């Protein structure tokens, strides 16, 4: 089979400037009738594959110029001339030469913009959720920058790991920062044995984690 | 304009068999070839087959050997691919696009087909409001938010005062516990805004044909 190696990530890019992604092959992609059997695509988030580059150069139609692809044949190059906010994402390199046709690992490009720090916002579990046995906190933190955090709760002062679920969503195609939701399950009834809750953020903005809280009662 | 439309997400038992479809419009459906590429959760692509309507002719990624076949039907313009003896390892997300011509590449992709192979019952989402609590929360802008919590399988939509409400959004990727995915989504409005405009999450649940308006009240 073959294999097209891509870095997982690529540095942080200024918004504006020059990138490059490549991609090496397990073995030469150009045919014996001459053609190059090459193609770069860009997935963004939540979205469907868009051809950016096919036959190693050739900008697809649907593509801005900003993006322009070069290669040795066994070596390949997607250049991005002014990088912009909306093209984060990932940028796989595939080939079809051979069966069974086959995509590199794809290459994450991120935007380095401004350090942000994250506003927190933390919910006590709702009267609905309780009725029910159930009783969830919600944490916030939304649009920081750079995407490193670590977050921490703590029930009446101690730290709890267990029963927590976080999710991230991707860096902004406007803003460019990251999101973050973490949420503590509990049951009603451990819920209802503690006063204090409390979600701790730590960030490269500040010294002192954020943190958010709230009593019971 | 060439146009992909791809049937709707499944959700079906391991050991049966599903077939989805890719009706496409815009372009002499006979004289392109139709691709098919899985994405498994949190992984790249991987190719299943290709094939030519105008002579029934397809190319196929023997990795799938008895697991997947392709087929045309000409007189509606749709490409269809069947996949058979179904394990989770066949959960993921199904694309199929076109090739734009000689050798260059998929120009056209259909929005995907989710596929869950899974025991489990499907169940329908909570949705819990998230309202200021105790902490007075900034002053300039107050954030909400909306639990989803207790549901099978994905996906869901969410949207906020029925997609008139879209800035300032951020609905997180669900995440799977216990045999069930939960999900939240928050939005940030101005707070002289709030509660004079009111605010609702909707929370579209397919599989279960389920949809649930919750309004955040203080
Ligand atoms: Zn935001
Ligand atoms: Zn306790």
């Known amino acids: 089979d073959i294999v097209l190696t891509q870095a997982a990530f690529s540095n942080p890019v200024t918004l504006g400037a020059s990138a490059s992604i490549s991609c090496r092959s397990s073995?030469?992609?150009?045919?014996?009738?001459?053609?190059?059997?090459m193609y770069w695509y860009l997935q963004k988030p939540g979205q469907s594959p868009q051809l950016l580059i096919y036959?190693?150069?050739k900008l697809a139609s649907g593509a801005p110029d900003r993006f322009s692809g070069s290669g040795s044949g066994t070596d390949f190059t997607l250049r991005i001339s002014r990088v912009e906010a909306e093209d984060v994402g990932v940028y796989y390199c595939?080939?079809?030469?051979?069966?069974?046709?086959?995509f590199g690992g794809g290459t994450k490009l991120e935007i380095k913009r401004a350090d942000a720090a994250p506003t927190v916002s933390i919910f006590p579990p709702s009267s609905e959720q309780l009725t029910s046995g159930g009783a969830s906190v919600v944490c916030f933190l939304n649009n920081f920058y750079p995407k490193d955090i670590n977050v921490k709760w703590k029930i009446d002062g101690s730290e709890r790991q267990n029963g927590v679920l976080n999710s991230w969503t991707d860096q902004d195609t406007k803003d460019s920062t990251y999101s973050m939701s973490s949420t503590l399950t509990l049951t009603k009834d451990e819920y209802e044995r503690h006063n204090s809750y409390t979600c701790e953020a730590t960030h490269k903005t500040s010294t002192s984690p954020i943190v958010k809280s709230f009593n019971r009662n | 304009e060439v146009q992909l439309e791809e049937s709707g997400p499944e959700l079906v038992r391991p050991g049966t068999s599903v077939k989805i479809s890719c009706k496409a419009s815009?372009?002499?459906?006979?004289?392109?070839?139709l691709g098919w590429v899985k994405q498994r959760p949190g992984h790249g692509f991987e190719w299943i087959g290709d094939?030519?309507?105008?002579?029934?002719?397809?190319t196929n990624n023997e990795k799938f050997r008895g697991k997947a076949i392709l087929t045309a039907d000409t007189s509606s313009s749709t490409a269809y691919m069947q996949l058979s003896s179904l394990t989770s390892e066949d959960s993921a997300v199904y694309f199929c696009?076109?090739?734009?011509?000689?050798?260059?590449?998929?120009?056209?992709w259909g929005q995907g087909t989710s596929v869950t192979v899974s025991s489990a019952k499907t169940t329908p989402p909570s949705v819990y409001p998230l309202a200021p609590g105790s902490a007075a929360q900034t002053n300039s802008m107050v954030t909400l938010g909306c639990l989803v919590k207790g549901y099978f399988p994905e996906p869901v939509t969410v949207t906020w005062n029925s997609g008139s409400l879209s800035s300032g959004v951020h609905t997180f990727p669900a995440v799977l516990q216990s045999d069930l995915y939960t999900l939240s989504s928050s939005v940030t409005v101005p707070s002289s805004t709030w509660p004079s405009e009111t605010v609702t999450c909707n929370v579209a649940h397919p599989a279960s044909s389920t949809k649930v308006d919750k309004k955040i009240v203080p």
């Open positions: 696009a076109r090739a734009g011509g000689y050798y260059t590449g998929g120009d056209y």
């Open positions: 815009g372009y002499t459906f006979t004289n392109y070839w």
């Open positions: 094939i030519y309507p105008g002579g029934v002719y397809t």
């Open positions: 073995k030469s992609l150009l045919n014996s009738n001459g053609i190059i059997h």
């Open positions: 036959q190693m150069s």
């Open positions: 595939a080939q079809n030469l051979e069966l069974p046709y086959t």
